[PDB]
Amino acid sequence: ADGVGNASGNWHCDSTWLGDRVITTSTRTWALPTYNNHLYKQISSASTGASNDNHYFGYSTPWGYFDFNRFHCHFSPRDWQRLINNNWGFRPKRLNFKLFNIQVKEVTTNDGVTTIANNLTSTVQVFSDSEYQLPYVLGSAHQGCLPPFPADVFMIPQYGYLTLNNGSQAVGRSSFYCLEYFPSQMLRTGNNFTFSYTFEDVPFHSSYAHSQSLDRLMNPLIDQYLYYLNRTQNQSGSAQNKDLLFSRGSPAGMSVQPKNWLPGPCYRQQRVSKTKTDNNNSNFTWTGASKYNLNGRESIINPGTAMASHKDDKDKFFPMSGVMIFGKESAGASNTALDNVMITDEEEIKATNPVATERFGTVAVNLQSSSTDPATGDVHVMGALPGMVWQDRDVYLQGPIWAKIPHTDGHFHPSPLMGGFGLKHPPPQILIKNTPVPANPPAEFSATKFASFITQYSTGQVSVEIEWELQKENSKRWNPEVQYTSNYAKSANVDFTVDNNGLYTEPRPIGTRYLTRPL
Amino acid sequence: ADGVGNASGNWHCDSTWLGDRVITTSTRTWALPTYNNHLYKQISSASTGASNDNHYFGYSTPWGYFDFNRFHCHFSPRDWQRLINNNWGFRPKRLNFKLFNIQVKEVTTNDGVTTIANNLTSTVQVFSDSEYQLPYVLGSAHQGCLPPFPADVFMIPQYGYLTLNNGSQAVGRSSFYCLEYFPSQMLRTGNNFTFSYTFEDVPFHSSYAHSQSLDRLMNPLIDQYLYYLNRTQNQSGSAQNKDLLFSRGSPAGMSVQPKNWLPGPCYRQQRVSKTKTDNNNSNFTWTGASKYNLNGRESIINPGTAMASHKDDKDKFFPMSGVMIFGKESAGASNTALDNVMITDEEEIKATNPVATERFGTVAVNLQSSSTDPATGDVHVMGALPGMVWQDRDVYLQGPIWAKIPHTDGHFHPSPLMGGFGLKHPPPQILIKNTPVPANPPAEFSATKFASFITQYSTGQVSVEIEWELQKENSKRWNPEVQYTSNYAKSANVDFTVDNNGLYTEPRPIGTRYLTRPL
Amino acid sequence: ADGVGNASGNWHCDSTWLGDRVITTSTRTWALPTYNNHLYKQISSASTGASNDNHYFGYSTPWGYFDFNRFHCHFSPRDWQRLINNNWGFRPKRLNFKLFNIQVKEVTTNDGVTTIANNLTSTVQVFSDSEYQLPYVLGSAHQGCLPPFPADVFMIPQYGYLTLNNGSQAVGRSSFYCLEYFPSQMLRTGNNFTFSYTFEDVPFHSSYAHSQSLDRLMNPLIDQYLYYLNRTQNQSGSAQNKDLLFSRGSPAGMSVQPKNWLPGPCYRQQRVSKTKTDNNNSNFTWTGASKYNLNGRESIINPGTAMASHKDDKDKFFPMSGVMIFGKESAGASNTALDNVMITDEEEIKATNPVATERFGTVAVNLQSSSTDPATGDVHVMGALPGMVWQDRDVYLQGPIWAKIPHTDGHFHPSPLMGGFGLKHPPPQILIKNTPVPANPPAEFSATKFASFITQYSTGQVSVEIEWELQKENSKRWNPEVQYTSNYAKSANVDFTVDNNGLYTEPRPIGTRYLTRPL
Amino acid sequence: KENSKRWNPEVQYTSNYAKSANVDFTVDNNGLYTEPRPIGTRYLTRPL
Ligand SMILES: Nc1ncnc2c1ncn2[C@@H]1C[C@@H](O)[C@@H](COP(=O)(O)O)O1
Ligand SMILES: Nc1ncnc2c1ncn2[C@@H]1C[C@@H](O)[C@@H](COP(=O)(O)O)O1
Ligand SMILES: Nc1ncnc2c1ncn2[C@@H]1C[C@@H](O)[C@@H](COP(=O)(O)O)O1
Ligand SMILES: Nc1ccnc(=O)[nH]1
Ligand SMILES: Nc1ccnc(=O)[nH]1
Ligand SMILES: Nc1ccnc(=O)[nH]1
Structure with a gap:
């Protein structure tokens, strides 16, 4: 339950600061089409004349997937400011997912005149691949994430994946996954889907910049007790003669002092x-x-x-x-x-x-x-x-959050090269698809594959709540620090705002490294 | 219950391995038309000019039936592999059936423009002939089974049967069954149907090949204590003379050794x-x-x-x-x-x-x-x-599972000749039909038969769960065994996969006899 | 335990009659050589010019096996007489095996003068393949069984087996078993081996002959109430004319009476x-x-x-x-x-x-x-x-006792065609072998295969006890029955006796069918 | 253990079924055990 005329979820969408914690919970309303006509299709670079480096083999799926792997899906520009301007670090702790107020419409097009009506009995299927049995496509910076601006409606991306390939051909070890071969929950208007995940222990993201440099890390006022070879040819003597003269670490020559x-x-x-x-x-x-x-x-x-x-x-x-x-x-x-x-x-x-x-x-x-x-x-x-x-690499208000550490024998400092947190067990991929609805079948049994379906799409809201852990700062620094600030000088439009046409715009990329911390 | 906007069942469709057990549970979405316009019709080879051996008499029914009597309805290609490559045998133990998210649509065709709308109050009827009172048509390898590929939508076959015939005519002892004369459950969108059956005790299916042959079953190193008539004409003597010379079972002549x-x-x-x-x-x-x-x-x-x-x-x-x-x-x-x-x-x-x-x-x-x-x-x-x-006869990934042992006085080693398990009481036939909906009747009573009906079809998912019992292997064989394996050599398409058009394809027939076992 | 100078078993060898039971326990003393020089060898009809029907592929093993699958291994001629002359049937119930007083000798041959000494520390290995994981060679009437005459010393046969073959070549599905890959018990003079098995339920062997025949099974004094077509051409009429004359079952024409x-x-x-x-x-x-x-x-x-x-x-x-x-x-x-x-x-x-x-x-x-x-x-x-x-087929004092029913999907009245009891789980094969004893090795490590061994053989007694169940007779027959009896007429030698040279001899084959029983 | 949700068959080590003079990983007519090829362990599939 419950019913047709009964909302199955509310619009939770706030942000709460609690000292060392901050819960960001944002909800957006989505739209899901029918992809590939409910068909799994083999796809390849085959017959594209594609370069040799661009060949690939894989399958496109009839499923759609949810993706909120971008900071601006959870932090408003202002919140991001709050965060980056006062904390030395942060990381995800636990999250909460929710699908609701799902509605399935059925479009009947004809004579150019298309009509959209409700199909009160249709179902939408969901399921989170919590055992990571499907190829992971999140964390490859694809479009289709939740929009930055809460008032935007978005289209769920289509789920496709790749596998081993030799040119535009496949190989024996190539894998083909059928998502219908996964237990998934079915929903009608009155139903909803919920699920919660807990992040693994991960280092705080360094949201600060160093106020010193490796080379300049010594005491400017004192010598060292170490010596270094300073000259191999004696100075003057009105002749250039071989030698071995040593000097000792001096502030006057930091570029040559033994370091650690x-x-x-x-x-x-x-x-x-x-x-x-x-x-x-x-x-x-x-x-x-x-x-x-x-x-x-x-x-x-x-x-x-x-x-x-x-x-x-x-x-x-x-x-x-x-x-x-x-x-x-x-x-x-x-x-x-x-x-x-x-x-x-x-x-x-x-x-x-x-x-x-x-x-x-x-x-x-x-x-x-x-x-x-x-x-x-x-x-x-x-x-x-x-x-x-x-x-x-620093992260950005519009950058990735996490990436799945590949399941390989070994790996070095697995921090996603393009920014983010490396997780052995990241938030699972949430898969959604509209279940097919056979159009009127022949009046006489035919075994051939069914290919006539009621055309329909679905829509509803999705809520994602994430609890973040903050690492407050206690710099004993005396002078003011740098801080992200919107320019006060007058202008025609306000940063991170809609324009006269209602188009939200993110003027620049905001990092997280403003506060200072010595080495 | 429950309701219109409430899913009456989820998509269970997995496979679970538990040592000596394996539960395969697969669900497909179906489509059921209105057959014969809700009419029972007599049918025969009469007036077909049909050969003398092809005559037949019977009735075609307005009902549809569920049929999952094919291994690929439950085992994915990979699972089948798991099975055949590591077990010496297997057999069905118990099953579970379920009908849900049933939706009844009513098509209104006109001016070539056909429209499909929901008839929220229509009903679909189901019932399992658990007393085997109807002619059994499952186990005759007919089409209409659940599709191998989970993502395929299928059409429920129409139920028809035969009876005693003399040429294209019937006989006194011929039987005519009316399915409406069976208590059946009626369903509307919010309803569902469930039922479970338990398989009878049956021999494991021999999923192995013998590593010896009847003739070559003796000790290659030792003689026998038995003798056989070796010659009836003495060798040489520069003449061919009658005789009676006996030799004793030797390895040098296995083809002549007394056997068991x-x-x-x-x-x-x-x-x-x-x-x-x-x-x-x-x-x-x-x-x-x-x-x-x-x-x-x-x-x-x-x-x-x-x-x-x-x-x-x-x-x-x-x-x-x-x-x-x-x-x-x-x-x-x-x-x-x-x-x-x-x-x-x-x-x-x-x-x-x-x-x-x-x-x-x-x-x-x-x-x-x-x-x-x-x-x-x-x-x-x-x-x-x-x-x-x-x-x-071995069984195949796309072959029959069982067949009903005819109810006859006697029968010899009743194993379905075309592969499978012979069951005295097999899974019952599941019958489904859309209940008729009279179109607007005359405004003045007429006793003649009603023949004007709202045109409609139904659709929903069906789940079938079967618990199989495995017979693990413990071969003391030293050398590697043969095993089903997909070819690793590169190619354009992957075996048991969809193509660029979304057509699932089963490249070859897979048996079950790979593992070895001595006689 | 126990020790070197301590017998590890006595000579049990009697026969006990207990109404409906009879325990035969006989012990013989054996000799086991070293076969194949401790080597497993591939063997085939290859290069023998062998007929096409005599081809075969297999392996000869370094192991020896015990075989007491012949009635005369347990019944003395006199006992056999007792049995066949007074019982309508019999069958095996349970058995007991035992290996003892094992002694390992090491022969040192040289200059034609060979010397035999004890190797008090050598071991002999035994083990019963109680899980039937090895090819079964018992029940193929091979030599090497326990001698009929208790006072005879015998040589343990060598264990070899066959497998799938195509001409003189092998196939992928062929199997190769290594007996060292089986947990086996090791013994030195003071050790012994014991084990007991229980026979499966099996029909009594019919040790009787019928005193009636299928055709002559009716009442000689009375007619039947059934009729049969007696003539299709009328008798006489001074012409041969078509007809249909019926007669009824009469004693005067038993060969034509309807039977069952x-x-x-x-x-x-x-x-x-x-x-x-x-x-x-x-x-x-x-x-x-x-x-x-x-x-x-x-x-x-x-x-x-x-x-x-x-x-x-x-x-x-x-x-x-x-x-x-x-x-x-x-x-x-x-x-x-x-x-x-x-x-x-x-x-x-x-x-x-x-x-x-x-x-x-x-x-x-x-x-x-x-x-x-x-x-x-x-x-x-x-x-x-x-x-x-x-x-x-009847069994003989010198015939087989049992045979293993092949492990096949089906089988008809599986009674060993050459006489005996068909057992699904027969007495297991008892395997014995002398463990190798490396001769003096090089004084410098060499990885090549070791092929220099102390030449030795072993010897000891073996006891086999079997409890048989008798099916007494209660024939209400009045006249004397036929009975096996030794001829009383004088002669030079006594039947089933040694001669002047000490050679035991079994004059004729004795069946078991003497007593009468009506159909 | 593995729980691949892969749909198509995987590659598997298998002895060749085609007939021949000797069986792989077996002794010969002289009693010499022989290991015909080197067997790895990587046959089953797992996505990255
Ligand atoms: N910046 C970072 N530096 C080091 N490790 C990081 C990281 N961000 C995430 N990790 C990962 C998270 C966990 O996977 C852990 C590595 O776990 P395992 O691969 O040995 O099983 O460190
Ligand atoms: N391969 C097989 N071999 C023998 N019997 C089989 C079989 N497969 C199934 N059966 C049947 C199942 C049961 O019907 C039983 C026969 O039962 P009844 O007909 O005497 O009442 O054996
Ligand atoms: N003379 C005989 N007639 C019939 N059966 C006999 C027999 N002697 C032995 N058997 C076997 C012993 C058991 O194996 C039983 C058959 O058992 P299963 O092969 O169906 O599992 O009958
Ligand atoms: N940083 C690392 C050290 C050792 N092993 C790894 O996989 N990674
Ligand atoms: N195999 C059989 C033996 C006896 N009766 C039968 O009906 N079947
Ligand atoms: N006698 C038999 C009847 C039925 N099945 C068999 O395997 N054997």
């Missing part, structure tokens, strides 16, 4: 400028791109290793594929102008992580001697070395 | 080749066919006695009507090409059962003496002889 | 005479032999269906392969003279079973009419028909 740690790992990336003139005249997008080679296919590393987007005084350049880029509502599908996208800046970590477009360092390459000169080389790729420390 | 058992019974069948050239140029399909003669009418024995489909090294031939043949989805109604069907191979039993196209053996036909020579003959038909042992 | 039952099933066999002159001059041994065809290979049916060895007054002929034949101690391996074997006579069942060399009967083959004459044919092979009754 190393910058973060790094996989260098090409650098491009926001002013076309500076760029080389060619299309190096794929040519000079940092790609990884997985079984014959190349794939751009994007955004790849967390690295400072640019060195100080140069928010002019950016890693060719080392920064998150969101599109403004104006941006088109492909080859859209620069001012139609928003490129994130990850320079807040230049204090501990290597800059993405530069060399990580220099390495000795030979054995110097009186007869052969000491040579070196530039290291462009650097794996994990003991003593390394680093910061992970 | 005999191969299985046999009723020889003609042999045809898959390469037309080898075949005789004529249409012997019926001509040289093995037929039985029951009261003036002939009927092909098909598949008849369980016999090896061909001797070793010849999966090229096959019994003309001694093997199960399923059609690929491409196969047509009649006279379709070879590669549109799939012919089962029953050679796994050549170890104990006679080959179907050969003679069972040789028999002495006279009394030899010095004056008359010892003659013999080929035995083509062999009834049960004491000491006989045999294997029954 | 039919003789036993039958598969005709060629007939040969003990006096070569009567026989046809040719070698029809295989030519005109009744053979069965199992997957390309032919095999003589021997002894096949239980049938009377010859009609009354003709103990001169015999079925070419329808009677058991034991060899006298003088008989050679092959092509030995008639008087070196003993051919059993199964004429005691001519009262209910068909004679083996004759036709079972006559059958109508056409539809007679004034224009076409009534023809018939001789039926040489007859399967089981309802109403059939029959007697099984």
Whole structure:
């Protein structure tokens, strides 16, 4: 239960702050079509003339899925502000899902005149793959998430997946999943669906920027008790003579003092400028791109290793594929102008992580001697070395929240490369589909496959509640900190607001790293 | 109860393995038309010019029936694999039926424009003939079973039956059953129907192949203590002279050692080749066919006695009507090409059962003496002889499960000749029908039969749960066994999968005999 | 325990009669060699030029096995007499096995002078395959059983088995068993092995002959109330005219009276005479032999269906392969003279079973009419028909006791065709082997297979106790019955006795059918 | 144990059924045990 003329759920949609806790609960109203005419279909790069690196094999499903894996699905711009401006970190604790006031309509089109009526007896099916038995497509930054603006109605994305492929063909080990082979709950107007999940223990997300840097971590007023080789050729003597002179760590030469740690790992990336003139005249997008080679296919590393987007005084350049880029509502599908996208800046970590477009360092390459000169080389790729420390890619008000850690034998610091929390057991995929309704069948039994169905779609609200744990700050810093603030200068439109046509717009990407914390 | 806007059942459809048990529960969504305009109709071969062997008399009913008598209605291809690759046998224990979310629509066609609306007050009737008072039509391999692929919608078959006939006429002892003369439950959207049955004690199905053969069952290293007549004419003596020389069972002559058992019974069948050239140029399909003669009418024995489909090294031939043949989805109604069907191979039993196209053996036909020579003959038909042992026809992922043992005075090893379990009291026939809805009647009483009805059909889901009992294996075999495995070699489509158009396809027939067990 | 100088078992070997019970317990002393040098070896008809029907594939094992599957292993001639002369039937109930006083000797041969010494620390391994996981070779009438005469020392047979074969090659489904992969108990002089088994419920063996025959089972003094068609052509009328005259069952014509039952099933066999002159001059041994065809290979049916060895007054002929034949101690391996074997006579069942060399009967083959004459044919092979009754092949003092019913889907009256009790779970195979003893190994590690071993054999006593259940007789017969009796007439040697050289000899084969019982 | 919701059959290690002179992982006519090929453990499927 209960009934047809009885709401099966209310509009819960608030935000509650409780010291070290904050419950965000937002509800949006959705629309679900009938996909593929209730058919599972094999799909492939086959006959697309697709590049060799773009081949793929998989299946498109008749099911739709719920996806709220974006911060703006839960935090209003103002809340996000509250969060990033006063806390050193946060993480998800537990969540709550709910489907209600579901209504199934049946459209009868004819003579251009289409009519929409209720089919009070139709059902919609749901089920959460809580045992992760289906391929996981959440956490690949796809569209179809809950809209940022509560007053927006959205369309549920269609669920499709991929599997092992050799060119545009499949292989023996390829897998095909049928979602109807999963116990799922059926609903009619008066029914509703609910379910709760608990997040696994996960590190707080570092919502702060360091107020010191690895190199500048010593006492500016005092020497060290350590010495380093300072000269191998004596100064003057009106001749250049071989020697071995040592000096001891001085504040006057911090760049040469023995230290305890190393910058973060790094996989260098090409650098491009926001002013076309500076760029080389060619299309190096794929040519000079940092790609990884997985079984014959190349794939751009994007955004790849967390690295400072640019060195100080140069928010002019950016890693060719080392920064998150969101599109403004104006941006088109492909080859859209620069001012139609928003490129994130990850320079807040230049204090501990290597800059993405530069060399990580220099390495000795030979054995110097009186007869052969000491040579070196530039290291462009650097794996994990003991003593390394680093910061992970920051998250954004419109970025991903989590991603499922692949189920592999081993894995290194599994933090989703494009921002987020790495979960061994993430929130499960919620699958929904309209059950088929056979149109009038022949008056004489026919065994051939049924392919005539009442055309219909469904609609209802969905509520998602998440309890977040805050990590308050207690900086003993004396001077004011940086804080996200809307510009007070007058203008035609207000940031994160609708316009004269009712189109909600997210002007810029907001990070979370404003508050300071020493190393 | 309960209501209109309230689902009366969920989509249970899983599979659970519990050591020696396995519960398969699958649910499909169905569509039921109005058959015969709610009329019972007499039907016969009368005026069809039908052959003499094809005459028949019976009645077609306004009712529809549920039929899930095919393994693929319960086992997914993968499950079937699990089953056949690790168990020596299995059998049904108990089942559970359920009808729900039933919806009755009423189509109003006009001007080519047809409209489908709900008739919230209409009813559908169901009832299980649990006392087997109606002619049993399940277990005759008819279409209309639950689809293999869960996502398929199917049409319920129409229930018709036959009775005693003399040509195209009926006889005094002929029977006519009216299904409305059975207490049946009526349902409206909010209602549902449920019922459970328990299988009778039945032998496990032999899901294994023998790793020895009747003839080769002795100790290869040792003689016997028995002797046999070896020669009746002395060897050499530069003359051929009468004699009586005996030898004793030696490994050097196993084909002549006294044994304890005999191969299985046999009723020889003609042999045809898959390469037309080898075949005789004529249409012997019926001509040289093995037929039985029951009261003036002939009927092909098909598949008849369980016999090896061909001797070793010849999966090229096959019994003309001694093997199960399923059609690929491409196969047509009649006279379709070879590669549109799939012919089962029953050679796994050549170890104990006679080959179907050969003679069972040789028999002495006279009394030899010095004056008359010892003659013999080929035995083509062999009834049960004491000491006989045999294997029954294997079952297939897309074959029958059970059949009702006819209610006759006697019966021999009643295992359904075309595969399956012989049940004295099988799952009952589930009958369903849409109750008639008189269209507007005349405004003045008329006693003549009512023949104007609201045109309508119904639809809903049906769930069938079966608990199967497994007979695990404990072979002390040392070397690996054969196992059903999908080919790993790359290809365009995956076996037992949908294609680019959403058409599910069962590439080959899967048996159950892979594991080995000695005699 | 216990010790080296301590007997681990006594010589139990008696026979006890207890009304309806009789416990036979006999013990013999055995000798076990080292077979195959402790090696498992693949063996086949490969490269033997062996006939096509004699091909085979299998493995010879390093193990030996105990076999007491012959009546004379438990019954002395006198006991057998007691049994067959006073009981209407008997069957096995439970048994007891025991291995003791085992001694392992190690032979050191050299310069023709061989020396035998005790290896007090060597072990012998035993184990009963009580789960029937190994191919069963008992019940194939092989040599190596316990000797009839208690004072005889015997050699344990070597255990080998066969498996699926295609010519002299193997197949995928072929099985290879390693006996070392079975938990087995190890023994040194002071140890012993014991185990008990219980026979399954089985019909008593019919140790009697019928004192009536199927045809002559009515009242000689009274008519029947039934009539039969006696003439179809009127007698006399000085003309032969069509008619229909009926008579009623009279004692004067028993051969034509309606009856209730039919003789036993039958598969005709060629007939040969003990006096070569009567026989046809040719070698029809295989030519005109009744053979069965199992997957390309032919095999003589021997002894096949239980049938009377010859009609009354003709103990001169015999079925070419329808009677058991034991060899006298003088008989050679092959092509030995008639008087070196003993051919059993199964004429005691001519009262209910068909004679083996004759036709079972006559059958109508056409539809007679004034224009076409009534023809018939001789039926040489007859399967089981309802109403059939029959007697099984008798057992002999030196014949088999039981056989394992093959593990097949179905089987008909599974009584071992060559005499005995058909057991689903027979006494298990007892396997014994001398554990290898590495000779001195190289002084420097070598991974190659070890192939140098101390040459040794073992010896000890084995006791087998079986409790048999008797079925006493209570015939109300007035005249004396036939009884097995040794001839009283004087002669040079006593039957079932040793001769001047100490060679025990079993003069003739003794059946069990002497006592009478009406149908 | 595995609980793949996969629908199509998986790959499985299986001895070849085609006839031949010797059986895999078996002794020969001389009693020499032989391991014909190396068997891995990766046959069953599991999504990432
Ligand atoms: N930023 C981060 N750094 C390290 N680990 C993180 C992380 N975010 C999430 N994790 C994961 C969550 C858990 O999966 C844990 C790894 O668990 P396991 O893979 O060894 O079974 O750390
Ligand atoms: N493979 C099989 N072999 C023998 N019997 C089988 C069988 N499969 C099913 N049966 C039946 C099931 C039960 O009907 C039983 C026969 O019962 P009744 O007809 O004497 O009353 O054996
Ligand atoms: N002379 C005989 N006649 C009939 N059956 C006999 C027999 N001697 C032994 N049996 C077997 C012993 C048991 O195996 C029983 C058959 O058991 P199941 O094969 O149906 O499981 O009858
Ligand atoms: N960081 C890690 C250390 C060891 N093993 C892993 O899988 N990951
Ligand atoms: N196998 C059978 C034996 C006896 N009667 C039967 O009806 N069936
Ligand atoms: N005698 C028999 C009747 C029915 N089934 C059998 O296997 N055997």
